[PDB]
Chain length 25, copies 4
Amino acid sequence: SSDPLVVAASIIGILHLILWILDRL
Amino acid sequence: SSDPLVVAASIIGILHLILWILDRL
Amino acid sequence: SSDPLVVAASIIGILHLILWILDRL
Amino acid sequence: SSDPLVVAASIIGILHLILWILDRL
Ligand SMILES: C[C@H](N)[C@]12C[C@H]3C[C@H](C[C@H](C3)C1)C2
Ligand SMILES: [Cl-]
Ligand code: NA
């Protein structure tokens, strides 16, 4: 378990990774 | 729950997203 | 403990640091 | 509580913020 704030920041970072990849594909 | 250091790093990443957006609006 | 999404985002950030270092050595 | 990996990534993120601030002061 995690603070919902920590989960959201985690989803930002993962989505940041996704898009970084997609912009470079 | 989360360690308070993880919460603070979370709040930094969220605020970082906020400001990144604001500077681009 | 942490939520696996938080763990995954963590591994991204650590791996990001590693790569940033390696690209600059 | 958090996974030590989450704590580690959190410290990276907080130290990244600090350095970012210091390089711009
Ligand atoms: C570096 C990210 N902003 C991150 C987001 C979440 C909070 C902390 C640790 C990890 C999960 C990674 C900071
Ligand atoms: Cl956590
Ligand atoms: Na936790």
